Design a protein around this ligand. Structure first.
Ligand SMILES: Cc1[nH]nc2c1[C@](c1cc(F)cc(N3CCC(C(=O)O)CC3)c1)(C(C)C)C(C#N)=C(N)O2
Ligand SMILES: Cc1[nH]nc2c1[C@](c1cc(F)cc(N3CCC(C(=O)O)CC3)c1)(C(C)C)C(C#N)=C(N)O2
Ligand SMILES: Cc1ncc(COP(=O)(O)O)c(CNCC(=O)O)c1O
Ligand SMILES: Cc1ncc(COP(=O)(O)O)c(CNCC(=O)O)c1O
Ligand SMILES: [Cl-]
Lengths: 442, 442
């Protein structure tokens, strides 16, 4: 007693908007540092009938029966995960049930500290995530600043993590957890010095590696597993998996952590796991652990270094003057345009990026930079030589943005009126669509 | 720079387990009250490339650009939701971002009461959900009992909600929210009398209708939208959508609720929404609002009443002596077997059900009943006359369970030793597989 007609037949209205979405993705220079493109195999898993099954609990400790195959999938995902991140199953465990990165962080923090517990993270304005304790004078914006007592550390004027201020804050604040690993940080992290500060104050070391997970797994960047008590990561960014998250916990350093983390995920926070997610994550984690994927990850960094260099060669300033990873933050102050203005211009030419704070920005209102990243375009086959073109397009967007600002003014409302129909933007869009349009597309 | 090989090629190991899972679903009499089977169109949505897009924020208030088509999908889903539940967009709003039922409830509760806020819900042991404030002497099991201060009301000895006790408790406790709508409650709800208590103590009325959502939408059961401030529902049970959730809020009764609910979901709790989910929910909500789906929902109730009646005709006792909806709770006390024993026996014969507390149980260890429901089998094409066979199969499972208990003993460890190789079970399994395997399967 159901309708089995295809999506095109059953819901023509939705199938057209989805077909349009796919075409937009196909014809976009996607520089969102947190985005990627999943392969067909990952998307076969996400649409699999395995999502029909209620399987509350954990493998071999399920509430319901009929979970033999679901237990095999969840066991294969946890195993594949610990392997992918070069950790022994006797020393580290992994929870694979968190539905997204923010859920994973709230759950992991709750397990470590509980309600009213004290946490430290990087300020959002300096490159931290919302789930690292973000609040404002006007409000406790993230639940992580409200269910926990949080304190926020900043980067120095050059955009680097300032460990002297981290320590100064940690000694007087005395948090149970200190969070490192960031949303828009262009350099590698000195975990050892984080571990050194955590020991001193008897705080847990939390590493959120969502943005750099592939670099960690493939041993290109520093390894937080040598130092951290807890490692969280999303599976949908540079890792190129589905939208999901992983919580890692160090058993050897913290006996009893397994149960605290596991009970935090269920039944403290979540109900039934989404088994299609877990299948899809299992699938990508095999790819992640291959020499082929290490090559892709290496390519991400080569493109990023090359993109940084080309932008510098065109007299564009980068926060920290470069990058150790997949992402760059452009400092736009010398052109006197905001991040939001350039984001609007880039959207008009099918270039996807986001506005982003820089160190000099005291607030998150009027951020003076943008953030770009190479994983999505590296997935579509761009090599180092293609980064000149990406730099050229972004330079041209900055110039048009300055020109439009001159003509229509610095108020964002006025500025945008200059945008539609612009001859140069229509020209630049067409170049973007022509180049992007033809690149390999999963 | 990606592998586009199909799932079978790229990960043969995972593809076999998934093919096994699919076949197990095909050959099971699935009586899990909270389960269903999605159609192909909903699963096309879930495997769609729309999940590649980061779209933090709300439609037309997005952080990023390139969200024109994502904004169209999310607006379509919201519109389709409000129509499906027969409410005016002038008076009601809907948030479509919650990743699951449990997330939706924690988010919605936080919005209404905040950290340390006072909430009231049905005890888990009496049919409430975990996210309705569940705790135990030993521990605050749900975050809803830890981040909130919760009080728990029980059903009377006949299995009905006792409003006198609710009132007695509300007047003494003074909560900001009273939760009604349940996980294993076989009767309809007097929302009007819940509203009466809420008004009398100045508390919000929260209706979690995840289990009965189709009955509400199709005007078969009482309508909580006439009386409640907030209505949450999962989209994956009787509604037959993907794994996601919906928060409805009554603007007319509570000005400023829109922003409280919306900010709770993001950025208080979640990050980027899952666009494949939202698309998939959009797709199902169209079907939900059709005269054909009302017929399905009616069939769910006809099958349930007929199943209840056939079990009673075989001298099996039902909590509240019947049902007003899709689910039945069998009281097993007269056979001196636990729910866990029958669940084990039913898994051995490819019958999916779960153990469930009954009113006389003081603990959630050794529940004395099982819960069954008709949505999954109604989806597979079973009609009223097919319920006699289901009843016959369950009666035979109970008899075998009593006999096995006699032969091997009342300890669950000892009891299970009796199951493998049992001649009658293999026989009963084969009948189940033969009947189930034949039924229509989306
Ligand atoms: C969207 C999001 N999520 N997590 C993030 C961001 C970023 C971001 C950029 C921006 F322009 C604004 C905001 N805000 C989020 C909401 C917040 C509030 O509701 O009060 C106000 C500031 C966040 C960025 C990666 C897109 C950001 C930066 N910079 C950082 N560090 O992390
Ligand atoms: C699994 C789940 N989720 N939500 C639920 C359940 C049920 C359930 C049955 C059962 F036999 C046991 C439990 N527990 C959940 C965990 C809890 C703890 O960790 O302290 C112990 C008791 C829950 C049922 C629908 C399967 C249940 C009932 N009855 C109710 N009302 O709601
Ligand atoms: C460090 C970090 N942690 C957690 C998350 C949470 O992921 P979900 O959106 O899946 O909740 C993000 C996403 N940040 C968005 C971005 O960088 O564009 C992140 O950057
Ligand atoms: C009333 C109610 N509310 C919320 C949820 C949570 O849904 P998630 O599992 O999507 O978090 C459930 C699931 N209860 C499981 C069952 O009835 O079998 C439920 O019964
Ligand atoms: Cl999904």
């Amino acid at each position: 007693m159901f309708n089995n007609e295809p999506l095109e037949q059953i819901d023509k209205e939705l199938h057209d908007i989805l077909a349009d979405e796919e075409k937009r993705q196909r014809e976009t220079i996607n520089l969102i540092a947190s985005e990627n493109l999943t392969n067909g195999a990952v998307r076969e898993c996400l649409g699999n009938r395995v999502s029909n099954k209620y399987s509350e609990g954990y493998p071999k400790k399920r509430y319901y029966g009929g979970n033999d195959f679901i237990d095999k999938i969840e066991e294969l995902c946890q195993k594949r995960a610990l392997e992918a991140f070069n950790v022994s199953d006797e020393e580290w465990g992994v929870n694979v049930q968190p539905l997204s990165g923010s859920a994973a962080n709230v759950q992991a923090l709750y397990a470590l500290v509980g309600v009213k517990g004290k946490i430290m993270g990087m300020h959002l304005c300096s490159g931290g995530h919302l789930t690292h304790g973000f609040f404002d004078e006007k409000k406790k914006v993230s639940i992580t600043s409200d269910m926990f007592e949080s304190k926020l550390y900043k980067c120095n004027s050059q955009g680097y993590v300032d460990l002297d201020a981290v320590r100064e804050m940690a000694l007087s604040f005395k948090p149970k957890v200190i969070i490192c690993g960031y949303t828009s940080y262009p350099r590698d992290i000195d975990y050892q010095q984080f571990r050194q500060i955590c020991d001193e104050v008897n705080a847990y070391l939390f590493a959120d590696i969502s943005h750099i997970s592939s670099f960690v797994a493939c041993n290109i960047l520093n390894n937080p597993f040598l130092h951290a008590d807890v490692v969280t990561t999303t599976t949908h960014k540079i890792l190129r998996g589905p939208r999901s998250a992983l919580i890692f916990f160090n058993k050897k350093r913290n006996p009893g952590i397994e149960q605290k983390i596991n009970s935090a995920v269920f039944p403290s926070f979540q109900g039934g796991p989404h088994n299609n997610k877990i299948a899809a994550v299992a699938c990508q984690l095999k790819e992640v652990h291959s020499p082929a994927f290490k090559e892709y990850t290496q390519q991400v960094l080569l493109n990023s270094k090359a993109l940084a260099k080309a932008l510098i060669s065109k007299q564009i300033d980068l926060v920290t003057n470069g990058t150790d990873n997949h992402l760059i933050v452009v400092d736009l102050r010398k052109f006197s345009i905001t991040g939001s203005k350039l984001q609007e211009t880039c959207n008009a030419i099918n270039v996807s990026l986001n506005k982003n704070t820089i160190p000099s920005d005291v607030d998150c209102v009027s951020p003076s930079g943008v953030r770009i990243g190479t994983p999505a375009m590296t997935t579509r086959g761009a090599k180092e030589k293609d980064m000149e073109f990406i730099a050229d397009v972004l330079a041209r967007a900055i110039k048009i943005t300055v020109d439009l600002q001159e003509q229509y003014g610095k108020k964002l409302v006025d500025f945008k009126k200059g945008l539609p129909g612009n001859a140069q933007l229509q020209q630049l869009k067409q170049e973007v669509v022509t180049w992007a349009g033809a690149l390999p597309f999963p």
